[PDB]
């Protein structure tokens, strides 16, 4: 009386994740007014979210509901690698967007020279390659495996797939994928808020006769509340074996997945995108 309807939520999540990013990509590609230097980062982020929604989520839902992994071990490793790659690429693209806004606001005269159509491509490719070296290489070369007794039994059986990793890979992956972008974004947005407050102070000092907090709160709170709880327990469960159960780990990981759906509502609600969406359908 549960699994007959518990998949409806997963189906709705998949539909929303696919549709939002497909609409964003179609709006950027089809309408010529939108194409800009900053809009390419949104394109890469939407591509990462689309790949996640198309590949990662449905197989995880099937594994959860059916309780068995009917597919082979090779496909299981492929799925894990794709998952890690997509997560890393999405978070690093968010950090790139934040840094771009920092450079746009803090130094207005020199903004044009720093960012050009031929410099954005190299940055995006570097981000995706750095993401790829984290996921595919350590997994396919069999460096992340664990040596405790249950790990060998999990690896041998072809019917089951449970994540088992050693200490070094977990720590290094968490540090590379989450914490450094978090620090960079924190510093960036603190500086941006200071500049905005100074400008409002000047506009109040002249012509004498609150709004940035809402935007910054949305932008930081969504990402932090979505992704921070997962990585803390990700680091924790390795140092202390009995501390963290697997069900909470899976629940937090699936909470992290949903964050890909909220990105179009955050980064794509400008008037130009509204006009493009209105014209599209
Ligand atoms: C299958 N779940 C994976 C397992 C570990 C992991 C994830 C995401 C980013 C990382 O850097 C990780 O090390 C999770 O999505």
UniProtKB/Swiss-Prot annotation:
**Bilayer topology:** Multi-pass membrane protein
Q: What does this protein do?
A: Beta-adrenergic receptors mediate the catecholamine-induced activation of adenylate cyclase through the action of G proteins. The beta-2-adrenergic receptor binds epinephrine with an approximately 30-fold greater affinity than it does norepinephrine.
The residue ranges for the Cytoplasmic side of the membrane come to 29-41, 100-120
The family classification in the record reads: Belongs to the G-protein coupled receptor 1 family. Adrenergic receptor subfamily. ADRB2 sub-subfamily.
> What organism is the protein native to?
Homo sapiens (Human)
Chain positions recorded as (S)-carazolol binding sites: 83, 173, 253
What is known about its subunit structure? Binds NHERF1 and GPRASP1. Interacts with ARRB1 and ARRB2. Interacts with SRC. Interacts with USP20 and USP33. Interacts with VHL; the interaction, which is increased on hydroxylation of ADRB2, ubiquitinates ADRB2 leading to its degradation. Interacts with EGLN3; the interaction hydroxylates ADRB2 facilitating VHL-E3 ligase-mediated ubiquitination. Interacts (via PDZ-binding motif) with SNX27 (via PDZ domain); the interaction is required when endocytosed to prevent degradation in lysosomes and promote recycling to the plasma membrane. Interacts with CNIH4. Interacts with ARRDC3.
Q: PTMs?
A: Palmitoylated. Palmitoylation may reduce accessibility of phosphorylation sites by anchoring the receptor to the plasma membrane. Could be depalmitoylated by LYPLA1 at the plasma membrane. Phosphorylated by PKA and BARK upon agonist stimulation, which mediates homologous desensitization of the receptor. PKA-mediated phosphorylation seems to facilitate phosphorylation by BARK.
**Molecular function terms from GO:** adenylate cyclase binding; amyloid-beta binding; beta2-adrenergic receptor activity; identical protein binding; norepinephrine binding; potassium channel regulator activity; protein homodimerization activity; protein-containing complex binding
Q: What's the protein name?
A: Beta-2 adrenergic receptor
Question: Which residues bind (S)-timolol per the record?
Answer: 83, 88, 234, 253, 257
What is this protein's gene name? Answer: ADRB2
**What are the Phosphotyrosine sites (modified residues) in this protein?**
111
Q: Which residues lie on this side of the membrane: Extracellular?
A: 66-76, 145-166, 240-246
> Which biological processes are named by the entry's GO terms?
adenylate cyclase-activating adrenergic receptor signaling pathway; adenylate cyclase-modulating G protein-coupled receptor signaling pathway; adrenergic receptor signaling pathway; AMPA selective glutamate receptor signaling pathway; bone resorption; brown fat cell differentiation; cell surface receptor signaling pathway; cellular response to amyloid-beta
- Recite the UniProt keywords alphabetically: Cell membrane, Disulfide bond, Endosome, G-protein coupled receptor, Glycoprotein, Golgi apparatus, Hydroxylation, Lipoprotein, Membrane, Palmitate, Phosphoprotein, Receptor, Transducer, Transmembrane, Transmembrane helix, Ubl conjugation
- Which Gene Ontology terms of cellular component type are present? apical plasma membrane; ciliary basal body; cilium; clathrin-coated endocytic vesicle membrane; early endosome; endosome; endosome membrane; Golgi apparatus
Which residues of the whole protein are included? 31 to 340 of 413
Keyword Zinc-finger among record annotations: no
The chain's disulfide connectivity reads 76-161, 154-160
Q: Where in the cell is it found?
A: Cell membrane; Early endosome; Golgi apparatus
Residue ranges of the TM segments: 5-28, 42-65, 77-99, 121-144, 167-190, 216-239, 247-270
